[PDB]
From Swiss-Prot:
<dbReference type="GO" id="GO:0035578">
    <property type="term" value="C:azurophil granule lumen"/>
</dbReference>
<dbReference type="GO" id="GO:0001533">
    <property type="term" value="C:cornified envelope"/>
</dbReference>
<dbReference type="GO" id="GO:0030324">
    <property type="term" value="P:lung development"/>
</dbReference>
<dbReference type="GO" id="GO:0012506">
    <property type="term" value="C:vesicle membrane"/>
</dbReference>
<keyword id="KW-0084">Basement membrane</keyword>
<dbReference type="GO" id="GO:0005544">
    <property type="term" value="F:calcium-dependent phospholipid binding"/>
</dbReference>
<keyword id="KW-0597">Phosphoprotein</keyword>
<dbReference type="GO" id="GO:0016323">
    <property type="term" value="C:basolateral plasma membrane"/>
</dbReference>
<dbReference type="InterPro" id="IPR001464">
    <property type="entry name" value="Annexin"/>
</dbReference>
<dbReference type="GO" id="GO:0042470">
    <property type="term" value="C:melanosome"/>
</dbReference>
<feature type="repeat" description="Annexin 4">
    <location>
        <begin position="245"/>
        <end position="316"/>
    </location>
</feature>
<dbReference type="GO" id="GO:0019834">
    <property type="term" value="F:phospholipase A2 inhibitor activity"/>
</dbReference>
<dbReference type="GO" id="GO:0005765">
    <property type="term" value="C:lysosomal membrane"/>
</dbReference>
<dbReference type="GO" id="GO:0005509">
    <property type="term" value="F:calcium ion binding"/>
</dbReference>
<dbReference type="GO" id="GO:0045944">
    <property type="term" value="P:positive regulation of transcription by RNA polymerase II"/>
</dbReference>
<dbReference type="InterPro" id="IPR018252">
    <property type="entry name" value="Annexin_repeat_CS"/>
</dbReference>
<dbReference type="GO" id="GO:0007160">
    <property type="term" value="P:cell-matrix adhesion"/>
</dbReference>
Amino acid sequence: PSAYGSVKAYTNFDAERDALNIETAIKTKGVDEVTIVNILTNRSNEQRQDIAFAYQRRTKKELASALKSALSGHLETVILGLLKTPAQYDASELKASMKGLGTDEDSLIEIICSRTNQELQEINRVYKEMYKTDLEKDIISDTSGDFRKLMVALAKGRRAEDGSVIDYELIDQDARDLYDAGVKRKGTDVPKWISIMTERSVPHLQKVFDRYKSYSPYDMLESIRKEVKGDLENAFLNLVQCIQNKPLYFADRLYDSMKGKGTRDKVLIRIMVSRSEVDMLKIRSEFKRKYGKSLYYYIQQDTKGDYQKALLYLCGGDD
């Protein structure tokens, strides 16, 4: 279990009890959405799987299908998302990002740039089992140019994991190479940027980006804005933010999703669901530090109804 998640395993857990109570809630005239939300947002992902199993054995109906039939709107999206395992949820979100003629590059980038090697290994495996095809093949068919190269490289999840051994010489050489490949000359050696940023460990790259400031007039993020454009630039910016401060990265994404009129629910829901058992506590801390008011407050003031209640539970409170 992650100590930085907002959703923790329920102590007095009884899958049968929850399955019985959810069944009654589903069959209540008009549905008792409150009970369904109160239960599922207060159980760990694993516990939800146990609940789904108990539910089917007792009713001969799959819980997911029962809820897709019983719920609708944004609430349905949150609840069904919470029922999928982490890998399954990410795999389905990735598949959804590449559905149709166009491609939701923003979603594809957010997911591919933020997941660890461990998470990506599972996503790749589950993706193959669910859609029968490979994740890489789909990315390749929905992207092109250097943007494709970068996304394919990242999706592989073969990033080095040089344990904890700091390589000061490589830190310096990588910083010099990133500079020589960009700001230092006319044009940009994008392949060098892709290699360094996708093959080195996160702790290493954090140190590289710091050492980079010693050679370059602008930091990594500004360097990216001056060297590349389009989806490629967007990908690099997201990637560097994820490396420098992943919790802050998500906090900014969350703020952006609610700032204006209405909310970009697709993003808001994916982050609340997917990071609820990973680093939501860190995301909350960075969000409050930067924006002043808590993430809870923004969710409260930007969504309504049972949907809002569900998201607030995933947030977990504020402190």
